[PDB]
Design a protein around this ligand. Structure first.
Ligand SMILES: N[C@@H](CCC(=O)N[C@@H](CS)C(=O)NCC(=O)O)C(=O)O
Ligand SMILES: N[C@@H](CCC(=O)N[C@@H](CS)C(=O)NCC(=O)O)C(=O)O
Ligand SMILES: O=[N+]([O-])c1ccc(SCCCCCCO)c2nonc12
Ligand SMILES: O=[N+]([O-])c1ccc(SCCCCCCO)c2nonc12
Lengths: 208, 209
């Protein structure tokens, strides 16, 4: 039914994989090594010359957030109504903004930039704590009282930041509890513990 | 009006959503924030991610330019005819966003030193949208399907600002060129694009374009 085409890294597929696993969906992983990519043929066929590429039957998609939104739309993980859908997008766009900064650090400026990045991190995380505080005291999900694709993306963002800056959630009780709660969902817990996840590096350059 | 746009006195990340509203004949209010007012700090501190645009739809307050686009897309029926088309609309918009981020980085962080390399790389960055047009009714309608979507307005803005940056950049892309001409000629949009409301704002906030 579903196929994920990507490099052997967590990266921009981590959240959509968590979503699929937690939702009890089956999918095929099509692994593309850097050597295979460097040949050029698959890259030339990709819409924006990049991975992930995703297949849902005869539908082929590119763009990690398009894949998330598609799964959210088709699986009912996109809020209860239009108002919640907009809030879901607002969270996801915020997650994407911080992910872009994280990626820039990892791949272009790790040694020289890490200190300033970590110093700035609390101010980058506080909006998500605020979002939780304004939704049922943070006891459920990031938007409303059902899970959305933005929860999986935010969860991944938080997990990778815990590796980059251990203790970065200690000042944020709602985010800390939210990470624990979501990570304990049975199917997700099983996936996060699986070698499929654990034995992939977070990024492609050995930095985290 | 039920809609309010809160932004700096520039086109920037509100240009597409304004084009959308104008072309759809929807009324809205502009609340202008000067750099002076912004530097005071109170509005900024109240913004979810410390940034503008801020958007109000009745008592619904939104941040994030693409969130605003998607919201208006949903509520005004500019988000495809079915679930498959909606995904394709997202795929276009995400591509537009990726290039817009590169454009913004050039404008604000590296204009003089980076422009030549950027313009050299531009055809490769525009080609995917030409490809999308070529695979949809010979490029004679919209970017996805046979009705306009929020992605059309965002793509259109992206193309317009790149024509200012790199005049003639669409000479290599007949479908994109015709597409810009066609959408820009839509009566309400044409009127808006010619109006002081649009013309008298700079594209960006630093005087570069
Ligand atoms: N906006 C894209 C970015 C994807 C991207 O940056 N792809 C990287 C891997 S995560 C890639 O394919 N790099 C190989 C290349 O550019 O040649 C998304 O969200 O999917
Ligand atoms: N991801 C945001 C980016 C918004 C953004 O970069 N805002 C700029 C203006 S376009 C800003 O508010 N800068 C002022 C500041 O950061 O203090 C969006 O798409 O709305
Ligand atoms: O999000 N990324 O920028 C990103 C994700 C995953 C990877 S894994 C390896 C991909 C292949 C290398 C790039 C093409 O020679 C990245 N390598 O460089 N940037 C990467
Ligand atoms: O998309 N942008 O990076 C962007 C948009 C609009 C503007 S307009 C002026 C905003 C005020 C900047 C704050 C100065 O203390 C930008 N100025 O710097 N980056 C800007």
């Amino acid at each position: 039914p579903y196929t994920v085409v990507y490099f052997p890294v967590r990266g921009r597929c981590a959240a959509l994989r968590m979503l699929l696993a937690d939702q009890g969906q089956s999918w095929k992983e099509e692994v593309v090594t850097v050597e295979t990519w460097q040949e050029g043929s698959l890259k030339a066929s990709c819409l924006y010359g990049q991975l992930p590429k995703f297949q849902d039957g005869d539908l082929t998609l590119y763009q990690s957030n398009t894949i998330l939104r598609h799964l959210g739309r088709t699986l009912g993980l996109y809020g209860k109504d239009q108002q919640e859908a907009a809030l879901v997008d607002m969270v996801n766009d915020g997650v994407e903004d911080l992910r872009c900064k994280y990626i820039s650090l990892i791949y272009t400026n790790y040694e020289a930039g890490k200190d300033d990045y970590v110093k700035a991190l609390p101010g980058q995380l506080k909006p998500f704590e605020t979002l939780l505080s304004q939704n049922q005291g943070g006891k459920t999900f990031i938007v409303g009282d059902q899970i959305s694709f933005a929860d999986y993306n935010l969860l991944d963002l938080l997990l990778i930041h815990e590796v980059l800056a251990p203790g970065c959630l200690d000042a944020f009780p709602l985010l800390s509890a939210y990470v624990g709660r979501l990570s304990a969902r049975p199917k997700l817990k099983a996936f996060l513990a699986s070698p499929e996840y654990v034995n992939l590096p977070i990024n492609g350059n050995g930095k985290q």
